[PDB]
């Protein structure tokens, strides 16, 4: 029920650390509201959407195929690999690896895909190549979680808008990317918990043990996304339950005032 910026500021007062938020109109790219839009936050698992943007850009360029099968071994597994640990014999295709990285936040899926492009610094080069000179990935999973592996709310939002609506990717690749974010399985306690019946939402969350939480999302009424929302929090000693609740309440405020 309070206006959104009031609720964001309240959330920060209750939690400590910092909360960064931006709401952007999808069609025009106008910023509708924001708080700490230019300050840095840890990306956490939200990078996995940017990583699969770089893989689909390779597919558009004829350098990669979503159906290409990758075989890997027990040695390649890192912490939190719920889908990849189940395919040691059959492997996964590049498309399945992106689905696992986005919809389950599978960490070995993200590492395998980072190998296909030459590592974290090459992801950062793809971002630079599209006009985002702020966002940087420096680490492999599971140890993203200083300025390493960070973005700002306005950099991430703008970059997500460029991937989803721009002509940087083909229409089929842009649709594949939003399809995987719409199928996200692990963000149910965040924005999803405040969405009314019939709205569209495509999202990717991030968390660290550890103090941090974030979500990036494209959402809108009547089955169509019309706004991008980015929320990042870092730096507090609050519990996971408390961080999830504040995000769901900021979500309720932006819907009630849409
Ligand atoms: Ca404050």
From TrEMBL:
<keyword id="KW-0479">Metal-binding</keyword>
<keyword id="KW-0732">Signal</keyword>
<dbReference type="InterPro" id="IPR000871">
    <property type="entry name" value="Beta-lactam_class-A"/>
</dbReference>
<feature type="binding site">
    <location>
        <position position="13"/>
    </location>
    <ligand>
        <name>Ca(2+) 2</name>
    </ligand>
</feature>
<dbReference type="InterPro" id="IPR023650">
    <property type="entry name" value="Beta-lactam_class-A_AS"/>
</dbReference>
<dbReference type="GO" id="GO:0030655">
    <property type="term" value="P:beta-lactam antibiotic catabolic process"/>
</dbReference>
<dbReference type="GO" id="GO:0008800">
    <property type="term" value="F:beta-lactamase activity"/>
</dbReference>
<keyword id="KW-0614">Plasmid</keyword>
<keyword id="KW-0106">Calcium</keyword>
<feature type="binding site">
    <location>
        <position position="12"/>
    </location>
    <ligand>
        <name>Ca(2+) 2</name>
    </ligand>
</feature>
<feature type="domain" description="Beta-lactamase class A catalytic">
    <location>
        <begin position="25"/>
        <end position="232"/>
    </location>
</feature>
<dbReference type="InterPro" id="IPR012338">
    <property type="entry name" value="Beta-lactam/transpept-like"/>
</dbReference>
<comment type="similarity">
    <text>Belongs to the class-A beta-lactamase family.</text>
</comment>
<dbReference type="Pfam" id="PF13354">
    <property type="entry name" value="Beta-lactamase2"/>
</dbReference>
<protein>
    <recommendedName>
        <fullName>Beta-lactamase</fullName>
        <ecNumber>3.5.2.6</ecNumber>
    </recommendedName>
</protein>
<keyword id="KW-0378">Hydrolase</keyword>
<dbReference type="InterPro" id="IPR058200">
    <property type="entry name" value="TEM-12-like"/>
</dbReference>
<dbReference type="GO" id="GO:0046677">
    <property type="term" value="P:response to antibiotic"/>
</dbReference>
<dbReference type="GO" id="GO:0046872">
    <property type="term" value="F:metal ion binding"/>
</dbReference>
<keyword id="KW-0046">Antibiotic resistance</keyword>
<feature type="binding site">
    <location>
        <position position="12"/>
    </location>
    <ligand>
        <name>Ca(2+) 1</name>
    </ligand>
</feature>
<dbReference type="InterPro" id="IPR045155">
    <property type="entry name" value="Beta-lactam_cat"/>
</dbReference>
<feature type="disulfide bond">
    <location>
        <begin position="52"/>
        <end position="98"/>
    </location>
</feature>
């Amino acid at each position: 029920h309070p206006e959104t910026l009031v609720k964001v500021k309240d959330a920060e007062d209750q939690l400590g650390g910092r909360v960064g938020y931006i709401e952007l109109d999808l069609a025009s790219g106008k910023i509708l509201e924001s708080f700490r839009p230019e300050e840095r936050f840890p990306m956490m698992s939200t990078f996995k959407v940017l990583l699969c943007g770089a893989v689909l850009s390779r597919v558009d360029a004829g350098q990669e195929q979503l159906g290409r099968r990758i075989h890997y071994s027990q040695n390649d597994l890192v912490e939190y690999s719920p889908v990849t640990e189940k395919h040691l014999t059959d492997g996964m295709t590049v498309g399945e690896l992106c689905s696992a990285a986005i919809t389950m936040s599978d960490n070995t899926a993200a590492n395998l895909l980072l190998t296909t492009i030459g590592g974290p610094k090459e992801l950062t080069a793809f971002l630079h190549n599209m006009g985002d000179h702020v966002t940087r990935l420096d680490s492999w999973e599971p140890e993203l979680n200083d300025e390493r592996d960070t973005t700002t709310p306005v950099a991430m939002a703008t970059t997500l808008r460029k991937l989803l609506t721009g002509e940087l990717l083909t229409a089929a690749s842009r649709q594949q990317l939003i399809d995987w974010m719409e199928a996200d399985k692990v963000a149910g306690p965040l924005l999803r918990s405040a969405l009314p019946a019939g709205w569209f939402i495509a999202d990717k969350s991030g968390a660290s043990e550890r103090g941090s939480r974030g979500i990036i999302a494209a959402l809108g009424p009547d089955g169509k996304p019309s706004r991008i929302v980015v929320i990042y929090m870092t730096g507090s000693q609050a519990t996971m339950d408390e961080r999830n609740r504040q995000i769901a309440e900021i979500g309720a405020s932006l819907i009630k005032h849409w």
